[PDB]
Each structure stands twice: as structure tokens, then as C-alpha cells.
Scaffold this active site. Structure first.
Site, short mmCIF file in Angstrom:
data_model
loop_
_atom_site.label_atom_id
_atom_site.label_comp_id
_atom_site.label_asym_id
_atom_site.label_seq_id
_atom_site.Cartn_x
_atom_site.Cartn_y
_atom_site.Cartn_z
N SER B 41 67.68 20.66 50.88
CA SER B 41 67.18 21.11 49.58
C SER B 41 68.23 21.64 48.59
CB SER B 41 66.04 22.14 49.75
OG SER B 41 64.79 21.48 49.94
N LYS B 44 68.56 20.35 44.96
CA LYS B 44 67.59 20.62 43.90
C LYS B 44 68.20 21.39 42.73
CE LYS B 44 63.61 20.05 46.89
NZ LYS B 44 62.98 20.54 48.15
N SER B 99 61.48 25.43 46.61
CA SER B 99 61.99 24.31 47.34
C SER B 99 60.90 23.24 47.52
CB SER B 99 62.55 24.78 48.69
OG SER B 99 63.67 24.04 49.09
N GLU B 135 62.47 12.94 49.24
CA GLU B 135 61.89 13.86 50.23
C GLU B 135 60.73 13.12 50.86
OE1 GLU B 135 63.12 16.62 50.96
OE2 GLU B 135 63.95 17.68 49.23
N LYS B 203 70.52 28.44 45.98
CA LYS B 203 69.56 27.44 46.40
C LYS B 203 69.76 27.15 47.88
CE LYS B 203 66.12 24.79 46.48
NZ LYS B 203 65.89 25.42 47.84
N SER B 204 68.72 27.38 48.65
CA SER B 204 68.78 27.20 50.07
C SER B 204 68.56 25.77 50.52
CB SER B 204 67.80 28.12 50.77
OG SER B 204 66.51 27.79 50.43
N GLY B 205 68.89 25.52 51.76
CA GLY B 205 68.67 24.23 52.38
C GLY B 205 68.30 24.38 53.85
N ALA B 206 67.36 23.56 54.31
CA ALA B 206 66.98 23.50 55.72
C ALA B 206 66.62 22.07 56.11
CB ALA B 206 65.81 24.45 56.01
#
Lengths: 271, 258
Positions: B41, B44, B99, B135, B203-206
């Protein structure tokens, strides 16, 4: 519950990070989009992002609670037959009607909706954009089980499934097989489940394998649950998972006493 | 130091990539800076930057409609406004704040798909980022798969251009950083690793294979901003990540820039 296992999804808000206080002696868990709740010794515990006040626990939830449920933005608890609701309320999902403030036997939450079962009658409030809170006349008596989906709701009456709300992917078109002998129901965003004498029945969307029920879950199943795009079944203490590439990790291969499916995060309570 | 980063990898059984830029001194910190990780993510924030590059602020007010057909999972915001629509700007905001994957896909579409996103990054001199899928399948993170990957150095460089560089004019930079501020998905990552009086826009990501990322522009109270990219992954497809890796990697960076 000797222990608690949470898994699956991005866990972007910590909804799947169960705090120590809720690691054991838990009776039930309820999963919402950004939060989780646990019922321990009559007390409601919670964790995650408190974006809407869903983790701001009413004093009444501190003891003597019988059940919990959770939607996208809100929390529900059942106590002395009264439905208690808190958190986000833009669709009226936490405005509990007087009819549900006593005599209630069960509760369930949809994404933006809340449901109560009172002497066989389903009572619903909150969002009704897809007709999910307009209760069919049939669901107004003789109901024994219920659940909320995203745009849908489901109930069991005389062992037959009743389904209402959105039907874009056919998720409220009830198959012949689920019109008698059913014990329980569970709604996903675009699919629905029934449990019929240990056999899981699934209908609606299958683009992500939601209704591709594994052979193991065709008999001897004691419990079902549904997240948005995945499903869970409990069979002799072993969790079976399918849809959206969900699997059951080795930690839940035995000794599981109950299951809960949040929209993304799955939870297993172990004896 | 590099010793600290190395120990973190061992402590958490993970592979770690780091690149950070103190824009006050132009000093940098790097650890496996050119190794590929699935970006998940974190794209984004950058794609929102590209959106801002290619559209007037007035354009963000346009209503975008979409149906239940269009929804993918991990879309709490878009699934709510299905049918009646959201503004373009609300879409970008949803992707960055929640997200929201369906929002991410709509964002992709608006800048010409994953390859339109890649092209805009190429045009900014980024020849590393590979964007291939929408996605939610872009989170697959198969080891050795170059699809939907980048490096901490490439991502951090892009983020700097957008939030503290010339890729956007100041008013648009401000919209982007606003979108990136104050979001819960950021709480356990960079934000958890820096002093509480610092401001963090992240901005996070997983993703799969234990992929866990965070990128951010951060402001210490009396200083110019620091740009940070921290990426991580693990050996097992079904691995569980640990946010503490990211938070502790961030403390290391704070200390190094003291």
C-alpha cells in the site's frame, strides 16, 4: 478460553493484535473493521483504533454482559435483555429502539446496522440503503438465529433461511437445500453461509472462491462464521478456512472452542 | 548505525531495507537501500502525488461513481459510498488514510493503470519501480518476483520529490501531506519510533511474505523535514510481521540524525 488466536488480513489498525488482558478467560470475541471486542467475565474489553468511539466503553458494559457484536464503526452488547450500542452512528446504528431495550435474546451487527432477536422477532436499525434494515414479515416471528452482512442480513426460521438486502451476486437468493434443517447463518459482503446438520452450505459470489466449500466442511461441523470475503468453519476443534486465499494456521488445527470472523481478521478461542 | 539495523533483522527474523534523508543537511542513512521489496500500500501516497501532478485542485471535486461490481476487499470507505459515489479527492484521501484498495484501484485508473503510474515515475527519473498489478493481487510479494516492487532508496527519493521537492507546487504538496497526517494505520510504525513532539505524515504497507513497510516525511520541532522509507519482508508466505521492527528501525534513524 485458555488462549486466543487472531490471524489474516493486513491488521492495519491492530484489530488482530489481542492485548494480554484478553489472552485468556475470554468467553467471546467480536470483530469490527478497525477494532475488536472480547467478553471476559461479563466485562467488555476492546482493542484497535478508536476512530468513532467504538472503544469508548459505556459503564454498563463493565460487568454482567451476556453477548457482544461489532460492525464497521460501532459496538453492541447484550445485558439483561437490553441492547447497548456505542461508536459511530451516522446511519442510526447505535440509536437503540425502545423495543430492543428489554427481552432481547440475541444480537448481531451489520457493517452499518444492528439487529436484535426478541421472542422470535428480528428487530433491525441503522443503514437501509440496500434494504438491510427492512425486516421481511417472515422474519418477524419464529426466528431462532440471525446475522448481519455488509449490505445484507440473514435469519433462520423453522430451520429455513430468510435473507434480505442487496442481491448483486445472488447472496440473498436462498438455495432449496437451506430452506429446512438449518441451524445457523452467516453473511459475507457478497456471499452467505448456512449450517445444516454439520454441513456448510454457501451461495452468492465465488469470484474469490467464497462458496467453494472444502470437502472437510461438508459434515461434522459445529460452528460457522463469515468475514467479508472469507469464511470459517469449526469441526471437532479444528478451524477450516476458505475464500480470498485464507488458510487456517497450525495454531488453530486443534483445541478450538469457538470462532469469530471480523471483516478481515479471524479469531479463534481455544479451551 | 548499520550494526543496529543488522541486529534488528536478526531480532525479528526479517529482511530490512532503509533509506532516509535529512533535508536539513542532505545527510542520508541507508541499509540494503537498493534491494527490492513489494511496495504494497505504500504506492498510494505516491500515486496520489501523481494524481495531483496531472490534475488541477478543482478536478478533485468531480464525482466518481462505481458499483458493487467494482469493489475489491480492504475497502472500508469505498464499500460505504458504493453507487452514490465520492469525489476524486475523497477517493485519493481514502486510499491514503484508510489504505482503501478499491480507492487505490480508482487512483491507478485515473493515472493510467499500474503502467501509467510507472511511466510517471520513469518521467521523474525513477527507473527502479515496477508497477504491474491492481489491488489486491499486487500484494502477493513472491520472493524473486519483480512485479510491484521497488527499493527503499527509490521510494524515499520519490517521496522527497513529492513532499519536500519540486515534483509538486507547494499548495499541492500541502494537500498530499495533509492526507498523510493523523492516520491510525501509521500509529505502530514510524510514528511509534520517533519522539511524540515530532510530526509524522506516513503511508503504511502490508503484504504477503510478512511484507511490512512504512514511508514518511517527518518534522522534528526545530528542524527541516526528514524523509524515511523503511521496508521489510520475511521467508514464509504466511509469516506474521512485527510492527516493532519498523518502529525500532525508526528510532535508529532518529538517533543517527540527532
Amino acid at each position: 478460553a485458555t488462549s486466543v488466536v487472531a490471524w489474516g488480513g493486513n491488521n492495519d489498525w491492530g484489530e488482530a493484535t489481542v492485548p494480554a488482558e484478553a489472552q485468556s478467560g475470554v468467553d467471546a470475541i467480536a470483530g469490527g473493521y478497525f477494532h475488536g471486542l472480547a467478553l471476559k467475565g461479563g466485562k467488555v474489553l476492546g482493542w484497535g483504533a478508536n476512530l468513532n468511539g467504538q472503544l469508548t466503553m459505556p459503564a454498563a458494559t463493565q460487568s454482567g454482559v451476556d453477548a457482544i457484536a461489532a460492525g464497521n464503526y460501532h459496538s453492541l452488547a447484550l445485558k439483561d435483555g437490553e441492547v447497548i450500542a456505542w461508536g459511530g452512528n451516522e446511519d442510526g446504528q447505535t440509536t437503540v429502539p425502545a423495543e430492543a431495550r428489554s427481552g432481547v435474546d440475541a444480537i448481531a451487527a451489520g457493517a452499518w446496522a444492528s439487529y436484535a432477536l426478541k421472542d422470535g422477532k428480528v428487530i433491525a436499525w441503522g443503514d437501509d440503503s440496500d434494504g438491510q434494515t427492512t425486516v421481511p414479515a417472515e422474519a418477524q416471528s419464529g426466528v431462532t438465529a440471525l446475522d448481519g452482512g455488509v449490505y445484507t442480513a440473514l435469519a433462520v426460521k423453522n430451520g429455513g433461511v430468510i435473507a434480505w438486502g442487496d442481491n448483486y451476486f445472488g447472496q440473498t437468493t436462498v438455495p432449496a437445500e437451506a430452506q429446512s434443517g438449518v441451524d445457523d447463518v452467516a453473511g459475507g459482503i457478497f456471499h452467505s453461509l448456512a449450517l445444516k446438520d454439520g454441513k456448510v452450505i454457501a451461495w452468492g459470489d465465488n469470484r474469490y472462491k467464497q462458496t467453494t466449500v472444502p470437502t472437510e466442511a461438508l459434515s461434522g461441523v459445529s460452528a460457522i462464521a463469515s468475514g467479508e470475503w472469507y469464511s470459517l468453519a469449526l469441526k471437532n476443534g479444528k478451524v477450516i478456512a476458505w475464500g480470498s486465499s485464507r488458510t487456517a494456521p497450525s495454531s488453530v488445527q486443534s483445541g478450538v472452542s469457538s470462532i469469530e470472523a471480523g471483516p478481515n481478521a479471524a479469531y479463534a478461542l481455544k479451551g | 548505525t548499520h550494526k543496529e539495523f543488522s541486529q534488528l533483522e536478526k531480532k525479528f527474523d526479517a529482511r530490512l531495507g532503509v533509506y532516509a534523508i535529512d533535508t536539513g543537511t542532505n545527510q542520508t542513512i541507508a541499509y540494503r537501500p537498493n534491494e527490492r521489496f513489494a511496495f504494497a500500500s505504500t504506492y498510494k501516497a505516491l500515486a496520489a502525488g501523481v494524481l495531483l501532478q496531472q490534475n488541477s485542485t478543482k478536478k478533485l471535486d468531480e464525482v466518481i461513481t462505481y458499483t458493487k461490481e467494482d469493489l475489491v476487499d480492504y475497502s472500508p470507505v469505498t464499500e460505504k459510498h458504493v453507487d452514490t459515489g465520492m469525489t476524486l479527492g475523497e477517493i485519493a484521501e481514502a486510499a491514503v488514510r484508510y489504505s482503501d484498495n478499491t480507492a487505490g484501484n480508482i487512483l491507478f485508473h485515473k493515472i493510467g493503470g499500474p503502467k501509467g503510474y510507472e511511466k510517471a515515475l520513469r518521467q521523474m527519473g525513477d527507473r527502479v519501480t515496477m508497477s504491474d498489478r491492481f489491488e489486491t493481487e499486487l500484494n502477493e510479494a513472491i520472493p524473486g518476483d519483480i512485479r510491484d516492487t521497488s527499493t527503499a532508496k527509490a521510494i524515499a527519493t520519490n517521496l522527497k520529490a513529492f513532499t519536500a521537492g519540486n515534483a509538486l507546487p507547494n499548495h499541492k504538496r500541502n494537500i498530499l501531506t495533509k492526507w498523510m497526517k493523523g492516520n491510525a494505520t501509521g500509529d505502530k510504525l514510524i510514528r511509534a519510533g520517533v519522539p511524540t513532539n515530532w510530526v509524522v505524515a506516513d503511508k503504511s504497507g502490508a503484504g504477503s511474505y510478512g511484507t511490512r513497510n512504512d514511508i514518511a516525511i517527518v518534522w522534528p520541532p526545530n528542524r527541516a523535514p526528514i524523509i524515511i522509507a523503511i521496508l521489510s519482508s520475511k521467508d514464509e508466505k504466511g509469516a506474521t510481521y512485527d510492527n516493532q521492527l519498523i518502529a525500532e528501525a525508526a528510532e535508529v534513524i532518529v538517533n543517527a540524525f540527532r
